[PDB]
């Protein structure tokens, strides 16, 4: 099928000690401007880095001068790491991400409840782009409205809560208006006083 | 670095003592999958992604070998300088709107984790029911954050974090 390729960690030549490595691909306008940065980290302090804008290893602390000089000599290492912008970033974007991450769309669940203040809870959607607006009798009310930040759920779903300060007199109609890319037409949920 | 999306590919984390390793992929802050180093298996966050793409878990095992190696060398290079601990912070919230009676998930979000070794547990009595923990996530400052999940049937909880950079285990109430 279509396959994820990870970078290749360059190798080097009580009390606890921690090592960590990562490859950060940075896509802007799809694959138009890719940037590729690999980082090696010992005890939370980053010590060696590759940056595709630099074109070669550099050392972020002194403890990393060995590995940056070394990895810059052996061109089997440096040309390969330079090429991981294609064999990892461009490849994973134009490949598996397109069949998975970039195609996930999950429609929000919008429900209103009265804790007076009405709360519009918008849950379990992807991607992150969402607009949530309150109307009163068909009139956008941006006064007394307060939302959460984008709350990331950690299961590939987000969640936002929009509370409105109001006072109900029988007959009034408050509506929560939710715009999202998963949505054909915007969702509206009404609450009659 | 400004960007539209961010693939964070092949995160290899190793620490000794304990031989504790972890290999994950990430996209736009969300975990694609980890490689299980014992059962040697790609474990996807979303099963439905395991059906539309794949990753050979042996790239993970060889990258974890490389990274263990580098941990030995750099341990020695700096003359066995040890890692400094951190105080992690939790935050407890529900997955869906809390409707007494209907089934829901309860999310404990811990951050400023370093090193990546934490115990995260949950009425003033311990629970091991619908507990799902996530992998360690990467922070821009090279600390970690982890999310624990507890499925519960709401009715009229404390997240208990036990770490090293915590003088006493901390509780966040519900």
């Amino acid at each position, epitope marked *: 099928r279509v*396959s994820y*390729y990870g970078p*290749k960690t360059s190798p080097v030549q009580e009390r606890h000690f921690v090592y960590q490595f990562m490859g950060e691909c940075y896509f802007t306008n799809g694959t138009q401007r890719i940037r590729y940065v690999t980082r090696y980290i010992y005890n939370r302090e980053e010590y060696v880095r590759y940056d595709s804008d630099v074109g070669e290893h550099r050392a972020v602390t002194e403890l990393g001068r060995p590995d940056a000089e070394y990895w810059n000599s052996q061109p089997e290492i440096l040309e390969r790491t330079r090429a991981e912008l294609d064999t990892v970033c461009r*490849h994973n974007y134009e490949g598996p991400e397109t069949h998975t991450s970039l195609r996930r769309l999950e429609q929000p669940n919008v429900v209103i409840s009265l804790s007076n203040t009405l709360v519009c809870s918008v849950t379990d959607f992807y991607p992150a782009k969402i607009k949530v607006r309150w109307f009163r009798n068909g009139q956008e009310e941006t006064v007394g409205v307060s939302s959460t930040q984008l709350i990331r759920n950690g299961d590939w779903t987000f969640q936002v809560l929009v509370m409105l300060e109001m006072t109900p007199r029988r007959g009034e109609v408050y509506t929560c208006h939710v715009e999202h890319p998963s949505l054909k037409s915007p969702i509206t949920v009404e609450w009659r006083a | 670095i400004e960007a539209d999306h961010v693939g964070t590919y092949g995160i290899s984390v190793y620490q000794s003592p304990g031989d504790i390793g972890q290999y994950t992929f990430e996209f736009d802050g969300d975990e694609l999958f980890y490689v299980d180093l014992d059962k040697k298996e790609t474990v996807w966050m979303l099963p439905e992604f395991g059906q539309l793409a794949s990753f050979d878990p*042996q790239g993970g095992l060889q990258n974890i070998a490389v990274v263990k190696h580098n941990l030995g060398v750099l341990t020695k290079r700096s003359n066995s300088t040890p890692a400094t601990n951190e105080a992690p912070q939790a935050t407890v919230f529900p997955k869906s709107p809390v409707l007494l009676g209907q089934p829901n998930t309860l999310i404990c979000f811990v951050d400023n984790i370093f090193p990546p070794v934490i115990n995260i547990t949950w009425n003033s009595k311990s629970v091991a029911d619908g507990v799902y923990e996530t992998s360690f996530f990467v922070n821009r400052d090279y600390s970690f954050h982890k999310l624990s999940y507890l499925t519960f049937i709401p009715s009229d909880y404390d997240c208990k974090v036990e770490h090293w950079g915590l003088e006493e285990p901390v509780l966040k109430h519900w």
Partner: T-cell receptor
Amino acid sequence: AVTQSPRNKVAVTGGKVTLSCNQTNNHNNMYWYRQDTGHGLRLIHYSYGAGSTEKGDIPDGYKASRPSQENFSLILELATPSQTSVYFCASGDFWGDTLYFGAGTRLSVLE
Amino acid sequence: QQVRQSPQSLTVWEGETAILNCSYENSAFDYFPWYQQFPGEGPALLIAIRSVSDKKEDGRFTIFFNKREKKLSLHITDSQPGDSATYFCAASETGANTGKLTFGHGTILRVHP
């Protein structure tokens, strides 16, 4: 260099044979192949570093053991006549373009 | 995914160019090393090509790579009799970081003086 031991071995069905491989290239990866006609070279077990071993394509009947960066040992606990063959060990660096083989081990398992 | 080599054995007289043929069925393979095994010994790296090239030249030995047909050929010119050995075509997709390598079944080249 990569050397194996023993170079030749006779054994009966149902005994414990232990091929063993030593490598002094400061390599990390070590492999255990077998060579039979009609089948080319076939991977049995391999390893990425000391403590770890991985199941190759034909792991049935063999165990492996990598106690050291330099040793890597194929182990047959109940040898069969189907396990007679020529075994080669290999090593290589991380992400290396080259495998480095040993001279070979002829093994006969006889009823 | 398999690697298939032809012919299963080749006999050549001192001077001819031997031609060992290989093909693979997995389009993701991108590194193709050929291993030479002398009798009684263990195989050693002879010559390797990468998928971004269509020909690697080294002495009397040359790899010809063809990506569209998924086909390789090793050409030995001025075939000495000491070239007699079994020649293995091998392939990996390097991207998967696995470490394993897929081996052809070998062709036995027996050169006559």
